[PDB]
Design an enzyme around this catalytic site. Structure first.
Site, PDB file in Angstrom:
ATOM      1  N   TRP A   1      -4.148  18.381  -0.533  1.00 50.21           N
ATOM      2  CA  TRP A   1      -3.174  17.320  -0.200  1.00 50.21           C
ATOM      3  C   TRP A   1      -1.903  17.237  -1.084  1.00 50.21           C
ATOM      4  O   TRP A   1      -0.855  16.703  -0.660  1.00 50.21           O
ATOM      5  CB  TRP A   1      -3.849  15.954  -0.104  1.00 50.21           C
ATOM      6  CG  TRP A   1      -5.094  16.022   0.716  1.00 50.21           C
ATOM      7  CD1 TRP A   1      -6.385  16.050   0.261  1.00 50.21           C
ATOM      8  CD2 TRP A   1      -5.165  16.139   2.143  1.00 50.21           C
ATOM      9  NE1 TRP A   1      -7.275  16.161   1.336  1.00 50.21           N
ATOM     10  CE2 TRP A   1      -6.546  16.213   2.498  1.00 50.21           C
ATOM     11  CE3 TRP A   1      -4.200  16.163   3.162  1.00 50.21           C
ATOM     12  CZ2 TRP A   1      -6.980  16.324   3.833  1.00 50.21           C
ATOM     13  CZ3 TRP A   1      -4.642  16.236   4.527  1.00 50.21           C
ATOM     14  CH2 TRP A   1      -6.018  16.321   4.836  1.00 50.21           C
TER      15      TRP A   1
ATOM     16  N   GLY B   1      -0.676   9.881   4.083  1.00 49.94           N
ATOM     17  CA  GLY B   1      -0.625   9.801   2.670  1.00 49.94           C
ATOM     18  C   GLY B   1      -0.089   8.481   2.176  1.00 49.94           C
ATOM     19  O   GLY B   1       0.617   8.426   1.146  1.00 49.94           O
ATOM     20  N   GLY B   2      -0.440   7.414   2.878  1.00 51.82           N
ATOM     21  CA  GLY B   2      -0.270   6.073   2.322  1.00 51.82           C
ATOM     22  C   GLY B   2       1.190   5.648   2.156  1.00 51.82           C
ATOM     23  O   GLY B   2       1.463   4.683   1.471  1.00 51.82           O
TER      24      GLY B   2
ATOM     25  N   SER C   1      -3.112   8.829   9.780  1.00 52.00           N
ATOM     26  CA  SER C   1      -3.107   7.824   8.720  1.00 52.00           C
ATOM     27  C   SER C   1      -1.733   7.138   8.624  1.00 52.00           C
ATOM     28  O   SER C   1      -1.296   6.589   9.630  1.00 52.00           O
ATOM     29  CB  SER C   1      -3.531   8.449   7.384  1.00 52.00           C
ATOM     30  OG  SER C   1      -4.247   7.489   6.623  1.00 52.00           O
TER      31      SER C   1
ATOM     32  N   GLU D   1     -14.450   7.421   7.835  1.00 55.75           N
ATOM     33  CA  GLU D   1     -13.106   7.062   7.341  1.00 55.75           C
ATOM     34  C   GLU D   1     -12.985   6.625   5.876  1.00 55.75           C
ATOM     35  O   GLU D   1     -12.136   7.119   5.136  1.00 55.75           O
ATOM     36  CB  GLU D   1     -12.616   5.892   8.186  1.00 55.75           C
ATOM     37  CG  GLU D   1     -12.047   6.301   9.532  1.00 55.75           C
ATOM     38  CD  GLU D   1     -10.921   7.306   9.374  1.00 55.75           C
ATOM     39  OE1 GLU D   1     -10.491   7.557   8.226  1.00 55.75           O
ATOM     40  OE2 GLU D   1     -10.497   7.855  10.387  1.00 55.75           O
TER      41      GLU D   1
ATOM     42  N   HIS E   1     -12.208  10.943   6.182  1.00 54.80           N
ATOM     43  CA  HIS E   1     -10.816  10.687   6.467  1.00 54.80           C
ATOM     44  C   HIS E   1      -9.988  11.953   6.273  1.00 54.80           C
ATOM     45  O   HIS E   1     -10.082  12.575   5.265  1.00 54.80           O
ATOM     46  CB  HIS E   1     -10.324   9.525   5.566  1.00 54.80           C
ATOM     47  CG  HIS E   1      -8.868   9.187   5.738  1.00 54.80           C
ATOM     48  ND1 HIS E   1      -8.412   8.328   6.719  1.00 54.80           N
ATOM     49  CD2 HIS E   1      -7.765   9.613   5.072  1.00 54.80           C
ATOM     50  CE1 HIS E   1      -7.094   8.245   6.653  1.00 54.80           C
ATOM     51  NE2 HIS E   1      -6.679   8.995   5.651  1.00 54.80           N
TER      52      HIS E   1
END
Ligand SMILES: *[C@@H]1O[C@H](CO[C@@H]2O[C@@H](C)[C@@H](O)[C@@H](O)[C@@H]2O)[C@@H](O)[C@H](O)[C@H]1NC(C)=O
Ligand SMILES: *[C@@H]1O[C@H](CO[C@@H]2O[C@@H](C)[C@@H](O)[C@@H](O)[C@@H]2O)[C@@H](O)[C@H](O)[C@H]1NC(C)=O
Ligand SMILES: *[C@@H]1O[C@H](CO[C@@H]2O[C@@H](C)[C@@H](O)[C@@H](O)[C@@H]2O)[C@@H](O)[C@H](O)[C@H]1NC(C)=O
Ligand SMILES: CC(=O)N[C@@H]1[C@@H](O)[C@H](O)[C@@H](CO)O[C@H]1O
Ligand SMILES: CC(=O)N[C@@H]1[C@@H](O)[C@H](O)[C@@H](CO)O[C@H]1O
Ligand SMILES: CC(=O)N[C@@H]1[C@@H](O)[C@H](O)[C@@H](CO)O[C@H]1O
Ligand SMILES: CC(=O)N[C@@H]1[C@@H](O)[C@H](O)[C@@H](CO)O[C@H]1O
Ligand SMILES: CC(=O)N[C@@H]1[C@@H](O)[C@H](O)[C@@H](CO)O[C@H]1O
Ligand SMILES: CC(=O)N[C@@H]1[C@@H](O)[C@H](O)[C@@H](CO)O[C@H]1O
Ligand SMILES: CC(=O)N[C@@H]1[C@@H](O)[C@H](O)[C@@H](CO)O[C@H]1O
Ligand SMILES: CC(=O)N[C@@H]1[C@@H](O)[C@H](O)[C@@H](CO)O[C@H]1O
Ligand SMILES: CC(=O)N[C@@H]1[C@@H](O)[C@H](O)[C@@H](CO)O[C@H]1O
Ligand SMILES: CC(=O)N[C@@H]1[C@@H](O)[C@H](O)[C@@H](CO)O[C@H]1O
Ligand SMILES: CC(=O)N[C@@H]1[C@@H](O)[C@H](O)[C@@H](CO)O[C@H]1O
Ligand SMILES: CC(=O)N[C@@H]1[C@@H](O)[C@H](O)[C@@H](CO)O[C@H]1O
Ligand SMILES: CC(=O)N[C@@H]1[C@@H](O)[C@H](O)[C@@H](CO)O[C@H]1O
Ligand SMILES: CC(=O)N[C@@H]1[C@@H](O)[C@H](O)[C@@H](CO)O[C@H]1O
Ligand SMILES: CC(=O)N[C@@H]1[C@@H](O)[C@H](O)[C@@H](CO)O[C@H]1O
Ligand SMILES: CC(=O)N[C@@H]1[C@@H](O)[C@H](O)[C@@H](CO)O[C@H]1O
Ligand SMILES: CC(=O)N[C@@H]1[C@@H](O)[C@H](O)[C@@H](CO)O[C@H]1O
Ligand SMILES: CC(=O)N[C@@H]1[C@@H](O)[C@H](O)[C@@H](CO)O[C@H]1O
Ligand SMILES: CC(=O)N[C@@H]1[C@@H](O)[C@H](O)[C@@H](CO)O[C@H]1O
Ligand SMILES: CC(=O)N[C@@H]1[C@@H](O)[C@H](O)[C@@H](CO)O[C@H]1O
Ligand SMILES: CC(=O)N[C@@H]1[C@@H](O)[C@H](O)[C@@H](CO)O[C@H]1O
Ligand SMILES: C[C@@H]1O[C@@H](O)[C@@H](O)[C@H](O)[C@@H]1O
Ligand SMILES: C[C@@H]1O[C@@H](O)[C@@H](O)[C@H](O)[C@@H]1O
Ligand SMILES: C[C@@H]1O[C@@H](O)[C@@H](O)[C@H](O)[C@@H]1O
Ligand SMILES: C[C@@H]1O[C@@H](O)[C@@H](O)[C@H](O)[C@@H]1O
Ligand SMILES: C[C@@H]1O[C@@H](O)[C@@H](O)[C@H](O)[C@@H]1O
Ligand SMILES: C[C@@H]1O[C@@H](O)[C@@H](O)[C@H](O)[C@@H]1O
Ligand SMILES: [Cl-]
Ligand SMILES: [Cl-]
Ligand SMILES: [Cl-]
Ligand code: NA
Ligand code: NA
Ligand code: NA
Lengths: 525, 525, 525
Positions: free
Chosen positions: C80, C114-115, C196, C323, C434
């Protein structure tokens, strides 16, 4: 003063006093080149142009046409004869506009009937000043060619393609699309209304893609194209065109030669011969009428109707209680306006022969069958022959048109006019005759001075409002004076509304038995 | 600083501190040529043009109009009197825009009520800075002509065609279509809201094809055009116009002469006479109001409503619990803001005479009948006369409008406002008076400093959100704070929602018995 | 060779060998002016222009952003982290186009998650060459600003208005509308897909009227704007902006001064402080994310969703079985990727404290209540805390979004991904984590060489076809290989489809009990 600038140039109207108020009339506005000479039999050509002011101050020439001479002196028939000079120079129209000049008025375009052989827009019973005064719509009417001068057909041949009267009508609607906004009229809110052949013509404008865009909604009084008198087939038309050439000694090898010859004949010789272009003709004969020209009309209208190929819109359709009586005194034996015409079985049988020339023996016996079983009356046969003629010719084709039309999604309203005018000059046994709702629609009984009853005023007032509500809003309610709501005509329920001076009623399935006979069974014979 | 470039030229606004934030106000933006001189009584004419910056920094002149002098010194009535100079030079409007300048804000256009005789947009209870602060919409309001100066009718006569106040309103909506995008506003997202005559005017913009394209949705608080005070018929209007000429000694042969004369009279003489142009007038009299001009309004609105001829959109409609009380202290015997007005049968009978001048004897007895059978209370007759007046005048015409409108397909929401303002200066027996939801809608109780209860803050907060959700999304839900879902008003179920400080409830069929009386039966008498 | 002429000028791509065939890649196409200097925090500005050929031959800079350092050396987390240089100069996008150049290909536009704090489009698991090879669509992806550099909000202030990353996304979609036809792509056939925060961004493009016209359909994998991490309110945003100023010693009187100061700080100082702008933050904290800017987003998205104010189109929405597990090893006590994390009640209680910082005592006890009644298992509490976190954060907001969206008329398809990657480097107890469907969607297991099972190839093959069928035809069937038909998600039945290597099943009402808890009850605490 009152000049209005149209596309063609300026025109002058005249003020009318109506019901303590003013209507502005424009009578006799040309809408086509006069169809004279080279142009006789052709489609109406776009009108020249012009400076100076055209006085549209009196009704213009009515189109050439044979006159009804069966009752000279008699108001019953004579009210229908042309009341202006006949002339091929007849492509004129009339506009009644409310005063003061409206801002955006709905327009009603009247198309007169008379079997496609006769009629004129300047008749007293077609006078638009009342509707304009009372409902503040603009009323328009046009003369269009009738008889052979208007319908002589030799199809695919622009020299006489057929349907010239219809294209006259169309050209008028166009003039309205192009010019009515200058008169305070809303070209996007036009309702065609017409009666008998006029009603049929309206129904044909519902089929003519050429007409789609030239009007909003439609009203059909006592007529529809699917009536058996309404459409000449290509065969019978051509036969008739030749038969005419023959009688004028205009038979030629070449077909443009036939037309060229027919154009040197004088209107009278053409008018005089029009009658015997047909084998055995009836009081309902339409010697020269609408055909499938492949221009105004692209296919047999029955097919287009059956197959939903028409303008999708609301319609208001209606007939009178005694549609067929008017015709029985033009040939039916032992009928007379001057007595009560109790006739015998034998006379009934002969009158069928008159109305169903041929028409097989069994055909006629089947009509006699369907129509002569009863609660047993001397007036029986007399009543039955009127009812035969109205059902076949007017009522059942109108109910079937409404049915077929309504099946495609649009709202339809059906009325059954059943009031006998208190002034009708025809005798009692004739009842609620063909054509005698018109004066109600045009609102003559609103005129206090004119020998109608109070009940008649009221009834016309209401009709006039329903017609107006229909044109403006596609819904022919009279919403204020606690009236009977007019329901839409559905296939299945077939509700229609009754117009009279007393009980106005909702009713279902008009002439149910009768129309199954005429609609299902009779075409087969 | 804050200049905004409109079509007419530049204009300056002023920053307001509101709830720890900023609203930008543009007060007194001209939208028409001042209707003075040659222009008095005419439709509003397009505004000159201009260089330099117009200061829209204070509220502009309010339109000529008679003042309520029944309670000098009393905040209850005086809160309604004009709070800026009267002048015919009054065609101005106001814009509140959130800071920072929004990108594409929904716009709410307020139209004030006051019987078409009075009112102004600069009232403290019409102040848009809260809605702009809180919901980030742009709020617009305009002054429009009232009384004869705004509604004097002589129809078909551009000198005084009728309906000038409405065309003033319309011209303002237009200014919004043309200019609001420069203020960060979305001309495609405009909700008209208004109260009483203001609510009626909104409902008339739903009928005026001229208005169709100048707004999105509508809110009607305590008023609708089908209320019996809302529309002067052509007759009574003309009568009234002449009656006025007579009282100013402006009777003339010619009608343009009458107008020309009325235009040399000074506003005061016109204002002074407006009252007795009517026979017996009531506390609800609308001496000069909307008419069927055949321009703004093309037919009797009842017909258009009945026949679905209106803008298809969502509506939010509502009334207050005690609509009629406010009026009883302007003529009803033994009523007074200063005691509890227990009245006798005899007094009730006389008050009807006051509210139903004529109106037949049997008519009045039928009202007394429907309204005086009870669970037997001294306040009976007092309660009954308020309820007679609100039902007839406000509640039932509003419920019927919603019903009729909703039948054509659009979502409709109906509310019943039942909270009595804790600050209402009128006494208790008057209950939840006509006009006293406005301050809730405009969100005054959101202002902590202003002597409203907490419960009141909460209730206004919620109303303000529902109004805002309605304008932006056509759905007046308050979705976040676990609220009662507002259902659409269907014909059949007629669900409406109750607004109060405690239990907000879904309820069905408001004033069922009462409205059948007023709606079905009463028009017949 | 392969130059393609865009609006901005020419660009060069590179040929890829894929599955015995060729994909053309365009990596690192600029789409905005680099947001440096004066431009940091502002909306992306239209890209200069240029002659000569831009080499789009390698992936471009990834946007500034903090890196995950919890497992240095560990492929699970490190897959990531950005795999190109970080730089504010990061507004680039990638195009994979099939060879030969397609004529009119549907386009899929990937938006990474990625939030809102991290991510980049150049990740190996986002590589579009397979989809382009296999389904012949064109795949596009863009980098957009994350963290404060992308979402720092000071609303109504173009210096840092909020939402810059979203407007970056939007500007990219635009570039696609303007340029993709030159790549053989159909600008009228664009499906946004994302995972996401990426999925949330997609759902926000469904609400942004600015985005309406820039795409056709949408896919939401494990994310939706109504998730509780997705939208910072105006308050918390402003708080956070100031808190940041404080930590960089950029507190100022004036607000443009604060921005001006924040712009002289170096990315690292901003990056370093971003973390403690929040009180108690969690492993799910979104320090700087989407806000209601009154530009991209006009109102709280919950309201717009509830009120049907969004792009009407089909959606495909889905979540993974486990998740929440990924997050428990970033702070939850006694969790570890390196053992099986059997935890105690007491540990469960403390982890709630970690995921629900405050969040009242009763709130936490109610979660423990709903989640700790069972068929009595040591893994109980461990299983329960993963399920708490996934349900609250991913599953239930996604099911509710689908529900709400689908209620307005559009087809919706819902999937429940339940296959654990056979290569997942995380341990077993974490299950179907997730983000670990992405590699299936992008079709990596289609690559025979890459250590996936046959069953995995098959499953990815099918997913890849359903995604493709969805984008092209709005219907995510796999029609050829006798598959289970995917039904639309109705409110009422709530059918969703299960994706795994064995039995693919139709199922109803995912997490019924669980979501009622989180969706109805929990917001109230
Ligand atoms: C009705 O009259 C019929 C019509 O014939 C003509 O008109 C009548 C009134 C007489 O004047 C006669 O000289 C004409 O021939 C008669 O044919 C019919 O029989 C009469 N029917 C009756 C009296 O019921
Ligand atoms: C209520 O008051 C009515 C109004 O009359 C006027 O106002 C009152 C308050 C007095 O000051 C009086 O001098 C005025 O005439 C009275 O008509 C009515 O009878 C009173 N009703 C009560 C006390 O119940
Ligand atoms: C699981 O491991 C937890 C995490 O703590 C850290 O990692 C473990 C693997 C050890 O290396 C330790 O030194 C670190 O503190 C432990 O907290 C937890 O108790 C362990 N649970 C088990 C074995 O079930
Ligand atoms: C007859 C003609 O062509 N035009 C006449 C015009 O000469 C005449 O003065 C007017 C009467 O008012 O009517 C028109
Ligand atoms: C009043 C006028 O001058 N023109 C109008 C036109 O703008 C409108 O579209 C139409 C509605 O049918 O009515 C006519
Ligand atoms: C149609 C038919 O059966 N026979 C026709 C007849 O009508 C017509 O009089 C004659 C001359 O046209 O030609 C033949
Ligand atoms: C079939 C036939 O004989 N056609 C002729 C044709 O040559 C000519 O165009 C026409 C002119 O009137 O006269 C005819
Ligand atoms: C000129 C000609 O062909 N005339 C015939 C004739 O024999 C017959 O009288 C008539 C009636 O059907 O039909 C036609
Ligand atoms: C022209 C006409 O109708 N003539 C008939 C005639 O045959 C008959 O004699 C008469 C009754 O007397 O009715 C009539
Ligand atoms: C449409 C209709 O029939 N309208 C009536 C009119 O006849 C009558 O005078 C009065 C009510 O009684 O006003 C209206
Ligand atoms: C009074 C007028 O016409 N324009 C004024 C301008 O002169 C003045 O300086 C400004 C005050 O800030 O307000 C505006
Ligand atoms: C934001 C702006 O400047 N203009 C928009 C316009 O493009 C859009 O069609 C409309 C939607 O109702 O909202 C306004
Ligand atoms: C309407 C009616 O019945 N009578 C009227 C009356 O209102 C009015 O005062 C007078 C002068 O206009 O003319 C008469
Ligand atoms: C009916 C009548 O008398 N009309 C006159 C008219 O000649 C004139 O246009 C108007 C000018 O104000 O004055 C009035
Ligand atoms: C000037 C005039 O005509 N006045 C009449 C009058 O007789 C009556 O007092 C009034 C009340 O109905 O109506 C009006
Ligand atoms: C102006 C007014 O309302 N007057 C009445 C009066 O008739 C009566 O005496 C009083 C009760 O005392 O109520 C009041
Ligand atoms: C629309 C509405 O009534 N909104 C409320 C507000 O009154 C309250 O302070 C809070 C929830 O309790 O946030 C929101
Ligand atoms: C580095 C650059 O700016 N442009 C290059 C060009 O010089 C080079 O020849 C080509 C290699 O095939 O790739 C591109
Ligand atoms: C293939 C091409 O060059 N252009 C087409 C366009 O004409 C069409 O309207 C569209 C359908 O969505 O597909 C793209
Ligand atoms: C939101 C709240 O309750 N308190 C805030 C806190 O978060 C923040 O650290 C401080 C500086 O902004 O201001 C206060
Ligand atoms: C409220 C306030 O202090 N505003 C000022 C403003 O004068 C100026 O436009 C801005 C320029 O950066 O700096 C700040
Ligand atoms: C600088 C400041 O105001 N800090 C406060 C602080 O008292 C507290 O530790 C924190 C946790 O809620 O909230 C904030
Ligand atoms: C960093 C961390 O997670 N520490 C805990 C520690 O409290 C505990 O002793 C251990 C079990 O031995 O689990 C772990
Ligand atoms: C969409 C999908 O899954 N397609 C299949 C592929 O996997 C397989 O090789 C063959 C059928 O067995 O052709 C196709
Ligand atoms: C489209 C037009 O709209 C307006 C109406 O006045 C017309 O009847 C027409 O329907
Ligand atoms: C001209 C024709 O001649 C033959 C007759 O049968 C027809 O009636 C027609 O008159
Ligand atoms: C057509 C327009 O679309 C946008 C909305 O903001 C408006 O309310 C309007 O509905
Ligand atoms: C001018 C008129 O005169 C008469 C009265 O009946 C009316 O009230 C009006 O004042
Ligand atoms: C309107 C367009 O039609 C074509 C399709 O390829 C696209 O998906 C889009 O639906
Ligand atoms: C700047 C702020 O300082 C205070 C703390 O409570 C917050 O965590 C934040 O760091
Ligand atoms: Cl009736
Ligand atoms: Cl509530
Ligand atoms: Cl399957
Ligand atoms: Na039969
Ligand atoms: Na009653
Ligand atoms: Na619970």
């Amino acid at each position: 003063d009152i000049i209005i600038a149209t596309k063609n140039g300026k025109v002058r109207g005249m003020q009318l006093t109506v019901f303590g108020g003013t209507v502005t009339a424009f009578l006799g506005i040309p809408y086509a080149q006069p169809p004279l000479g080279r142009l006789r039999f052709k489609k109406p050509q776009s009108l020249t142009k012009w400076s100076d002011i055209w006085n549209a101050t009196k009704y213009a020439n009515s189109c050439c046409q044979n006159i009804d001479q069966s009752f000279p002196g008699f108001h019953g028939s004579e009210m229908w004869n042309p009341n202006t000079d006949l002339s091929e120079d007849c492509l004129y129209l009339n506009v009644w506009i409310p005063a003061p000049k409206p801002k955006n008025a709905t327009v009603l375009i009247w198309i007169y009937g008379g079997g496609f052989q006769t009629g004129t827009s300047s008749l007293h019973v077609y006078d638009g000043k009342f509707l304009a005064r009372v409902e503040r719509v603009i009323v328009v009417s046009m003369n269009y060619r009738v008889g052979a001068l208007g319908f002589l057909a030799l199809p695919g041949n622009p020299e006489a393609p057929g349907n010239m009267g219809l294209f006259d009508q169309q050209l008028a609607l166009q003039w309205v699309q192009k010019n009515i906004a200058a008169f305070g009229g809303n070209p996007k809110s036009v309702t065609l209304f017409g009666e008998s052949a006029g009603a049929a013509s309206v129904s044909l404008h519902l089929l003519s893609p050429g007409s789609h865009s030239l009007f909003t909604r439609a009203i059909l009084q006592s007529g529809s194209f699917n009536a058996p008198w309404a459409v000449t087939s290509l065969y019978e038309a051509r036969n008739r065109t030749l038969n005419l050439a023959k009688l004028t000694g205009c038979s030629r090898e070449n077909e443009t030669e036939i037309i060229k010859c027919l154009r040197n004949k004088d209107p009278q010789e053409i008018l005089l011969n029009e009658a015997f272009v047909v084998p055995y003709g009836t009081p309902l004969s339409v010697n020269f009428g609408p055909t499938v020209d492949g221009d105004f009309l692209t296919d047999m209208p029955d097919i287009l109707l059956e197959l939903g190929q028409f303008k999708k819109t609301q319609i208001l359709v209606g007939v009178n209680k005694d549609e067929g009586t008017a015709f029985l005194v033009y040939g039916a034996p032992g009928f007379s306006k001057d007595n009560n015409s109790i006739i015998t079985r034998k006379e009934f049988q002969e009158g069928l022969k008159i109305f169903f020339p041929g028409v097989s023996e069994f055909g006629k016996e089947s009509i006699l069958f369907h129509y002569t079983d009863w609660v047993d009356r001397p007036e029986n046969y007399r009543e039955a022959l009127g009812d035969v003629v109205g059902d076949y010719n007017f009522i059942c084709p109108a109910l079937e048109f409404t049915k077929k039309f309504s099946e495609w999604g649009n709202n339809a309203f059906f009325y059954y006019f059943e009031h006998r005018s208190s002034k009708l000059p025809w005798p009692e046994w004739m009842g609620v005759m063909h054509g005698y709702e018109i004066e109600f629609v045009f609102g003559l009984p609103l005129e206090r001075r004119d020998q109608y009853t109070k009940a008649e005023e009221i009834l016309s007032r209401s009709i006039v409002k329903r017609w107006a509500n229909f044109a403006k809003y596609g819904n022919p309610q009279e919403t204020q004076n606690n009236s009977t709501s007019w329901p839409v005509f559905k296939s299945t329920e077939q509700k229609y509304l009754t117009l009279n001076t007393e009980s106005t009623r909702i009713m279902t399935k008009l002439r149910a038995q009768q129309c199954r006979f005429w609609t299902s069974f009779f075409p087969k014979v």
